[PDB]
Amino acid sequence: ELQARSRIKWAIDYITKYFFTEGIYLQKRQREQRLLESYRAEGKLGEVQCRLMEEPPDRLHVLDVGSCFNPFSSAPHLEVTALDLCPATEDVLQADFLKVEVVPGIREPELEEGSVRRLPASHYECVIFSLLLEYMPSAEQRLQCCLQAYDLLLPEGILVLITPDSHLMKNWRYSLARIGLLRVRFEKLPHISCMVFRKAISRELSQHWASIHREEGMCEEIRIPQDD
Ligand SMILES: Nc1ncnc2c1ncn2[C@@H]1O[C@H](CSCC[C@H](N)C(=O)O)[C@@H](O)[C@H]1O
């Protein structure tokens, strides 16, 4: 029995609205298509390749990284693959996410010696990093995780990012835009920030947005307060 008003219920509700009950993936699609027209009209971008999602399937492919106990798996039409460095429950796969390869053409996790080594590229409507990134040892490795999430997501799929409290979020927005993830939601919950980043229709589009909004002194990586 999940806690109401938790990060878990927030994410389930957002995922449902984004893919089914509010068609947010289409709203943001139109927004990105307008942004691309504006950039082309200013000569800042040429013809770029766009990749669009098809109508979402009823059962969404969801990857829960750092899952611990698979809280999302009973949520309606989420087909959850849950990974954790130290699984707490038997339905969570053991994996160090930093050592996972993203492989096109496979359709399920591939394990060696009980540890996930390979995950299907461009396969998941949604990737969830709920309180995960602050356990990574470096800002480089936090970015690495999001780069892998990018390769794992279908076009217009979403990376759900939940992180504790203690701006740095402006820099995260810039750094993720640089690699093709545009932020589409930010909400404060008790003691946490809840964010969603979308695999934009075009990586080059997102890259150019990031270029326009780069501020002095902000870095490429994903820092946390305890980087000092
Ligand atoms: N490199 C890594 N690869 C996979 N999981 C990792 C990891 N580093 C830390 N984790 C896991 O990430 C989890 C962070 S606690 C967050 C747990 C859960 N997602 C929640 O919302 O409460 C822990 O279970 C930890 O084991």
Listed by start position, the domains of the chain span 7-223
Residue nearest to atom 24 of ligand 1 (CA): 68
Pocket test for ligand 1, best of 6, 10, 68 (most atoms within 8 A of CB): 68
Residue nearest to atom 16 of ligand 1 (CA): 131
Ligand 1 binding site (Cβ under 6 Å of any ligand atom): 65-68, 83-86, 95-98, 130-132, 135
The answer to the question of whether 74 is labelled as a binding residue is: no
CA of 99 relative to ligand 1 center, distance in Å: 14
The answer to the question of whether 189 is labelled as a binding residue is: no
CA of 13 relative to ligand 1 center, distance in Å: 22
Q: Phi then psi for 17, rounded to 5 degrees? A: -65, -40
Residue nearest to atom 11 of ligand 1 (CA): 66
CA of 135 relative to ligand 1 center, distance in Å: 7
Contact 79, 59 (CB under 8 A): yes
The Cα–Cα gap between 113 and 12 comes to 32
User: Per residue in 34-72, is it b (16+ CB within 10 Å) or e — as a string?
Assistant: ebbeebeeeeebeeeebeebeebeeebbbbbbbbbebbb
The Cα–Cα gap between 203 and 82 comes to 27
Residue from 159, 124, 126, 165 nearest 145 by CA: 159
Q: Phi then psi for 21, rounded to 5 degrees? A: -75, -15
Contact 221, 142 (CB under 8 A): yes
**The CATH number fitting domain 7-223, selected from 3.40.50.10800, 3.40.50.300, 3.40.50.150, 3.40.50.970:** 3.40.50.150
- Token code pair at residue 46: 């040429």
The Cα–Cα gap between 92 and 76 comes to 18
Residue nearest to atom 7 of ligand 1 (CA): 85
The Cα–Cα gap between 194 and 129 comes to 10
Contact 171, 146 (CB under 8 A): no
The Cα–Cα gap between 112 and 18 comes to 35
Cα dist from 69 to 74, 87, 124, 129, whole Å: 12, 7, 20, 13
Contact 84, 66 (CB under 8 A): yes
